[PDB]
Symmetry: C3
Subunit: 281 residues, 3 copies
């Protein structure tokens, strides 16, 4: 739906309107977006102001790019992200990631909320993403579907190495270098489209396929980032333990997700700020 | 594709054209639709007569709403239902369920044919639906995809409690209260899009994911029903045992499905009639 | 997107423009398409020249039908095939198969490249397709989706018998009747949409579902072939072993796929030429 010149046009317009030249793109998950308050020399653009940039549908909170410095790194932050369940085609969801590349961004940090499928996980845990299962991708919902532009990347990119080995180590280390009672989790994120929450039978399916966490975002952005050669790091805030048996009378709800998001707020701003120092130049 | 005012407009037109005020919506599976003959004060509307109502594609049998009384309950019955495989988007397939809600319907009974994946199941068995696996949903084929209307329900409804506990018990009981040689089955229904029948490798996949029965309907209607707060009960007529090995020279066919449907006809009209008395007011 | 008269119009135009009356359709996988050089009385049509025929997107190699004789059989060969990942809807991908039927073709041979999921498989192996797993099909990406035309086939065709028993035997035999050090493999092909290569977690999923090989084609053509009653035989050239662990520093690439394709070239031209003699009349 976008031409190469649409991305270039959007990129140049952003370059013309900020002296900020970002290196790291950060995509904040639902209610982990207070992290814009830690930026310095913060310059804000509402999505509506940016050519070709999809406008958000959520009336409560309209999204924005915030350019700034986080702990030494020249950052662009996406507050309010796009999801399949809102009805965006994946070429709109992942439109920002290609703009970031053309701004000169070389690293993407992606964060999300997720339900715990791994029994060991607890509400409030952070799981680093070692790998993903792209269920939409298997069926044709891949953001690379359509003509490939060699200026962005190959027709057939690999994803076996999607989540940077170096950054995962340098994040386990960084987590030791704090006084955290609870250990830092690591695992496979499965993307489902949503927006409804899984049945018990569905949760059992996702456990058997070997997923540790389930969410409704991230994987499309990761594929497009890797397609054009960005280094990728990400993690999940476990907001809830997915109901895996028919005895329980507890039900997943977005209130849970927000609540866990407010509790983990300070911890996450800290973790992501310190991590900037571990990203090369 | 529909606005809130399209559903309201359709609802009011139906209210203006019948004195019937239904409480229970019943969606009859392929050849379980003789059950309209058990209604009293039956008033029939062809889909074509009803504003905004998708017309059926099947030339042989065009669908209709029948309003009437079944065993004390004010019912609306859907004879002829929509399937993904016919090329309807899921917002058309599940358009009726939202109209039912606005008519004042508070309960949905959904019935379907299905192939047996559980080896214990036999042709002619009835399986109550305890749970579903929404394979289309994982990939983006969820009827809630798009802008959410708070007047219908939440952005992120749970489905872990989709199939009413009370009604499943009150249906096992009701089945005892008859002279049935064969025991009443209970299990997970997996929706696939069809319209072609599964390979042996596919059948093995669906067994490993933990499905008991496989069909091509129902799950989208259930999600939209739950989204706007209807109580949901359903079951499958097992029409065939899915070929699970390469030795067999038997092939699934729609003739099997119809045939099993004619045999189970009297049993199903009876079962669903008696069940009306167990639905609250 | 096509009417019955579009296929008939394309068929008749091909009949009007060649005296060749083909019996066997062959769809050549990526770089197994030198096999057009073994035809005799070869008559070539570029896709662009053929009414209603999708034009290829690949600038390097534009596709063509080659009518000719291979080892006694009146053949039509498709060099350059369509894939979901290029953005074709499945009714375009499988448009040729319906034209073949109306030309009088009664047999389809389909070949593809694939990644090895079965640990026993080695780069350069040939796997006969006993069965498939249609992951896109489960979610709604089935080329039969939409109104069914009884002139092509049934609304609800079976696929449990998709890959001809007789031809698989007559191909194992044919392989003995050569001096091949390496044994001929047999297994389940899983179709995924691509075009990106699987993660380790994804590879593990496809192993657990019981797939031996993974590719991005073939299954839609097979379904439409069976729908209109063609006999179907096919195999995969194993071009690579899918990365199934996080230790490895090897990554799948399309260069691997091409390379394996050049090595297996002579072996495959031979195998498919000899197989013609085993196809009835
Ligand atoms: O058990 C589970 N199954 C499947 N998925 C999940 C998720 S993810 C998720 C679920 C519901 C709402 C969510 O977020 C919003 C929001 F997007 C809203 F717009 C909103 F208004 C809100 F209140 C939310 F909670 C998110 C986050 C989305 P992210 O962008 O971080 O990937 C958490 N738990 C589960
Ligand atoms: O092994 C199996 N695999 C996968 N699916 C199944 C089903 S479901 C199904 C399969 C073929 C035709 C069917 O029904 C029609 C019809 F819809 C027709 F229009 C028609 F003309 C006819 F003859 C049928 F049998 C249905 C019912 C559909 P329902 O609405 O009850 O959910 C039964 N067995 C299997
Ligand atoms: O581990 C794996 N995972 C998933 N899939 C595979 C495949 S299939 C495949 C992967 C990449 C490119 C491919 O082929 C082209 C091409 F289609 C091109 F257009 C091209 F230019 C080229 F260089 C190729 F290699 C094909 C063949 C396609 P076929 O039509 O034979 O089914 C091989 N290995 C794996
Ligand atoms: Na351009
Ligand atoms: Na309106
Ligand atoms: Na016509």
């Amino acid at each position: 739906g976008y031409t190469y010149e649409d991305y270039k046009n959007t990129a140049e317009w952003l370059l013309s309107h900020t002296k900020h030249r970002p290196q790291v793109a950060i995509i904040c998950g639902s209610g982990l977006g207070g992290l814009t308050d830690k930026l310095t020399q913060a310059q804000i653009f509402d999505y509506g102001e940016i050519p070709n940039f999809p406008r958000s549908t959520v009336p409560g909170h309209a999204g924005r790019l915030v350019f700034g410095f986080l702990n030494g790194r020249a950052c662009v932050m996406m507050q309010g992200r796009f999801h399949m369940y809102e009805g965006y085609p994946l070429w709109k969801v992942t439109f920002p990631v290609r703009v970031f590349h053309l701004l000169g961004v070389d690293t993407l940090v992606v964060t999300n909320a997720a339900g715990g499928l791994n029994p060991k996980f607890e509400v409030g845990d952070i799981m680093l993403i070692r790998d993903h299962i792209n269920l939409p991708g298997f069926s044709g919902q891949n953001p690379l579907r359509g003509p490939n532009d060699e200026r962005f990347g190959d027709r057939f990119p690999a994803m076996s190495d999607a989540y940077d080995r170096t950054m995962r180590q340098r994040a386990l280390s960084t987590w030791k270098q704090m006084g955290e009672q609870r250990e830092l989790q690591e695992g496979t994120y499965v993307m489902v489209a949503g927006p409804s929450f899984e049945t018990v039978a569905e949760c059992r399916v996702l456990q058997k396929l070997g997923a540790d966490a389930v969410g409704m975002s991230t994987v499309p952005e990761v594929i497009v980032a890797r397609h054009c050669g960005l280094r990728v790091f990400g993690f999940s805030l476990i907001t809830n333990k997915v109901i895996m048996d028919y005895e329980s009378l507890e039900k997943a709800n977005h209130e849970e997700v927000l609540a866990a998001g407010k509790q983990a707020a300070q911890k996450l701003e800290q973790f992501v700020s310190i991590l900037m120092a571990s990203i090369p130049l």
